[PDB]
Chain length 145, copies 3
């Protein structure tokens, strides 16, 4: 089976064997999470969300409607995603922009992923990066400082 | 009335009709929150805080003493504010620096707002931006990468 | 004694007099925390962790295995650390990279600290900075925008 911490609010039944969901996580009913994932403390996972097998999501990450994470992905702590390029309070788009993080990719701590982005298989996103364009498979991308 | 999630610690009675405060939020007694706000999971809202009507605060945001948010503002997930320009542990300033986010402005995901900042009406702050100077009304500002 | 909020999950007994640990914190058994610290809401503190006296850790910070914080350090909100330079899901290093934040240093809001980093005594890290190299004692470092 899977381990849901008593201090998490997990509303999805779609959770694979071996998955751990830690304290103060929120997981909404339609989320799909595969096997042997680690969803660390203080995460939010919305409804229109698919997460594969062997995925690590470190603390303080939110996975919004329209985001797909493939197998073997690493998401660093406080990584931020997004599904709305020109956000205005209470102006809901007809369709949320889709993001996909492809198999085995890794996103460094506190990176920011713009909406509509593909991060290719086995890519490596530097800690603190802002990703405004697709990252090609196996590419190491980081922002200039 | 307003919806306070049983898993939130909300100590303020100053909360407008239609406002939702989600899991694992902390709201201290003197906070003022207007009508039809959405305060998403994992937020912290301090005492000397005013938030207007129709404000969206996405997950993982802290609103410190000295911060005012006007009506119709969007604050993206993991946006960070601040009220102390030269922080040293246990060195408390006589007065906290004030920040104001003016009506209808939007702050992108994981942006960082320095203390003493005004963001003008209907401004748009790019995801991951560092805002070290006031942003003029209706201006789109983002950091070089 | 020390104050542990009923809404925190604190598993360490190694907590100094005067320390406050706030709502929705996780502190694992082997963590060492000194006297008169303030561990603000939504923090995660792992096992192989030493935190000195009079340390301020603002909301939404994770202190991983291999991180040491000396006395009188200020860590701003949503500051991110790290202990693994080339993270891949389920590829555990033999040894985690060590970070040390030296006495009286201050890290600004939403800064990102790469693994293996020393931040010298009384340094000041700008809000939103990415720290990829050691910061010398008493130096003010911030990223170009
Ligand atoms: C991106 C990364 C993999 C690159 O490592 P690397 O290829 O060995 O690169 P180097 O350390 O040799 O640094 C090369 C240059 O890029 C810079 N750089 C490296 N990482 C950077 C980053 N994340 N952001 C901005 N600049 C970065 C260095 O400052 C260096 O600059 P210089 O040539 O002017 O001296 C690594 O630095 C990184 O960010 N890893 C992610 C860590 C993480 O978030 N882990 C998960 C949590 S523990
Ligand atoms: C700032 C923003 C509104 C600009 O959108 P835009 O005006 O259509 O700009 P474009 O996409 O045409 O990009 C223009 C250039 O600026 C760069 N850029 C855009 N947004 C950036 C950002 N946030 N940070 C750094 N650079 C950015 C692009 O890389 C592009 O560079 P190039 O000309 O060298 O190719 C948008 O990118 C953004 O950041 N939106 C906020 C998303 C968000 O946080 N939503 C809330 C959570 S879903
Ligand atoms: C880094 C810091 C201490 C510098 O303050 P300062 O030395 O007075 O520097 P100034 O305000 O005079 O700014 C000098 C220049 O650096 C830039 N700058 C300042 N802080 C910056 C930062 N954090 N990131 C990027 N650029 C920064 C300014 O834009 C200015 O640019 P300009 O010369 O082109 O106009 C301060 O800006 C800071 O980041 N403080 C941390 C705040 C914080 O996180 N507190 C804890 C939470 S409240
Ligand atoms: C800073 C970082 O992300 N490093 C990673 C490291 O933490 C570890 O990540 P992973 O999540 O896979 O570690 P684990 O050993 O399987 O599980 C430990 C994590 O589980 C989460 N957890 C664990 C416990 C016991 C808890 O109570 N609450 C909680 O959230 C956070 C802990 O860091 O290994 C990666 C390769 C590394 O990149
Ligand atoms: C990534 C992002 O911020 N996108 C926004 C999007 O999430 C949505 O934001 P908003 O908060 O207004 O959405 P909503 O549909 O009113 O409410 C859903 C949010 O409520 C919060 N919530 C909701 C539930 C059900 C919960 O249990 N816990 C919780 O925190 C987080 C959910 O994303 O619309 C914006 C225009 C968009 O910019
Ligand atoms: C934005 C920022 O970090 N400013 C700092 C400011 O918040 C304050 O930080 P400190 O944590 O030391 O403040 P405090 O007055 O000792 O304690 C108040 C903090 O305690 C935490 N707390 C407090 C209460 C009452 C709570 O319920 N939950 C909770 O997490 C967050 C509050 O900001 O002083 C610094 C010099 C300043 O740099
Ligand atoms: Na952040």
């Amino acid at each position: 089976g899977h381990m849901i911490h008593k201090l998490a609010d997990v509303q999805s039944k779609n959770i694979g064997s071996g998955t751990r969901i830690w304290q103060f996580c929120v997981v909404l009913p339609s989320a799909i999470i595969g096997e042997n994932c680690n969803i660390c403390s203080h995460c939010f996972i919305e409804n229109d969300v698919k997460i594969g097998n062997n995925v690590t999501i470190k603390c303080g990450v939110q996975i919004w409607d329209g985001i797909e994470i493939e197998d073997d992905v690493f998401i660093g702590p406080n990584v931020t995603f997004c599904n709305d390029k020109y956000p205005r309070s209470k102006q809901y788009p007809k369709e949320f922009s889709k993001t996909i993080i492809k198999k085995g990719a890794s996103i460094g701590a506190n990176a920011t992923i713009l909406p509509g982005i593909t991060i290719g298989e086995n890519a490596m996103i530097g800690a603190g990066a802002i990703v405004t364009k697709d990252v090609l498979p196996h590419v190491t991308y980081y922002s200039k400082i």
